[PDB]
Amino acid sequence: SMSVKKPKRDDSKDLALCSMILTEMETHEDAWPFLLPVNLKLVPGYKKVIKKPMDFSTIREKLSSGQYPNLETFALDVRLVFDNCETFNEDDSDIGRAGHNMRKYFEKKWTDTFK
């Protein structure tokens, strides 16, 4: 509350560290369904079903242009990639498995870097 602050966590290396994590995800071999926006003209259903499209290239642009106020907002967009993947794909498909693999990959690096 007013004039009563919790001790200051050092957030000064967060930008660099999120960028490193994103690089590691961009270069994973199961990243391929997630590198670019889903083409909303050519994939039936995606536009209507998936309310908030997200992909790594779009996350990379937002990070590079000061569009993430903090590391929580960044983690939300990464999770959104995988949550959309589960909505639109069978677990038993190449894309469905890729999604599960990348989420697990992400979440370990997230915890090992920040928690």
What is the C-alpha separation between 113 and 3, in angstroms, rounded? 31
Q: Supply φ then ψ for residue 4, to 5 degrees.
A: -145, 95
Cβ-based neighbours of 79, under 8 Å, separated by 6 or more: 103, 106
- Distance from chain centroid for Cα 22: 8
Method used to obtain the model: X-ray
What is the C-alpha separation between 27 and 7, in angstroms, rounded? 36
Q: Which of 111, 24, 109, 14 lies closest to 63, judged by CA?
A: 14
Structural domains in the chain plus CATH codes: 1-115 (1.20.920.10)
Cβ-based neighbours of 55, under 8 Å, separated by 6 or more: 34, 35, 36, 37, 38, 81
Resolution (A): 2.3
Helix-, strand-, coil-residue percentages of the chain, each rounded to 5:
60, 0, 40
What is the C-alpha separation between 92 and 87, in angstroms, rounded? 13
Q: 3-state DSSP call for residue 110? A: helix
